Design a protein around this ligand. Sequence first.
Ligand SMILES: N#Cc1ccc([C@@H]([C@H](O)Cc2ccc(F)cc2)n2cncn2)cc1
Lengths: 217, 216
Amino acid sequence: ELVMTQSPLTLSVTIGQPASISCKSSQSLLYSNGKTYLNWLLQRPGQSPKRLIYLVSKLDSGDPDRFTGSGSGTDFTLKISRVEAEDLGIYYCVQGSHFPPTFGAGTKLELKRADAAPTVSIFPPSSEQLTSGGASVVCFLNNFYPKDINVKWKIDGSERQNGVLNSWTDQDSKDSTYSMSSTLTLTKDEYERHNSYTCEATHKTSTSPIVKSFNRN
Amino acid sequence: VQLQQSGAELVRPGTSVKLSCKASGYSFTNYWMNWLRQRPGQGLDWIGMIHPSDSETRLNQKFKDKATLTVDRSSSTAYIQLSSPTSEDSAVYYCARDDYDGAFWGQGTLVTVSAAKTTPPSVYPLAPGSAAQTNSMVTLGCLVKGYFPAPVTVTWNSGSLSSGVHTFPAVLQSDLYTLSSSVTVPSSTWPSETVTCNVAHPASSTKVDKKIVPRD
Ligand SMILES: N#Cc1ccc([C@@H]([C@H](O)Cc2ccc(F)cc2)n2cncn2)cc1
């Protein structure tokens, strides 16, 4: 199976500025007939994917001349001369030279803004939940930027990762920040076996671990 | 041109399901009909294609024992049947055309694979663990755990608390959905003033409130 590699997975842009996305294939896409089967699709939120470019550089009917596809062999590029709000979404490259066709992982366009440290909050299980036998510890890391954040749950010093659910909001429409939720669910017994619960985030806004903890006492 | 796809499907794991894609605006039997997949927050996967002229099929081997493609030329409808679907098969299924004559995608069909019956969420309060208050602001929240099917609607103080709110997208885990929501208010507002999340779950006809009581 042909491995398609896109970069970056997240492209920070500024409305009015140009954008460039890369797509590299594990093997050459030049087929035996002189044609290179590579297309680009844009998936706007809530929408279905829509092809914008085909055969490397042919623009689909309607596609603004702001879009330009290029490349050859195993290296291809999609350029936007000046990003507009309508261009926001997820862009995919797909090859059709090798069976079966495979898509790149996708490149989401996000708005650029200044770095913002996250506001971290940690919460112990509720007595209601403990009555039901479970114990979910929740951590909120809010309004940070960029999107890249490394969160670890440290229980009395050691990282534990048994029963975890993480959810991320879409980039905020107003302040362009990101927020994240991390829930560590243990059984009531497992929970009562430890004392210090810690939500630890590694983010570019700090050379030190951003932590918030609580002791079961 | 237009590809009309059938409605959302709730499928029990290990059983089966069949989706349709009705085409119009072009000659159905003149081009291959593709079927794609997009699992939760993931990328795109090409399942295979069928040519309605002779029902000839080319399948991504990865789905050979998963997808069966058929067609009904009478109503120019394409069908994809999934055998023994698992939780890993939950996703949005798309039928599409991508050829020299055109590039069109249906609106997509959501398939959720779960054995869960309608289940109201267990709403739990998220109150600070009596750990410092040096902060000018206070963040509280509600954990909306184990509900099905999606979705639920969460408000704070019946819509009185709007800004400072983050209601995270639900994650389908172990047949059930779980979602959380946070709200931030000044220290002078809570707990002197009551803060309550209101979780409404349409499917189970329930709407419950959960007041956030200060950590005793
Ligand atoms: N190897 C190979 C191979 C196998 C099948 C096809 C398909 C079709 O393009 C695949 C596709 C679907 C959606 C999309 F967004 C991009 C591409 N197809 C051909 N004719 C009509 N459909 C193409 C190449």
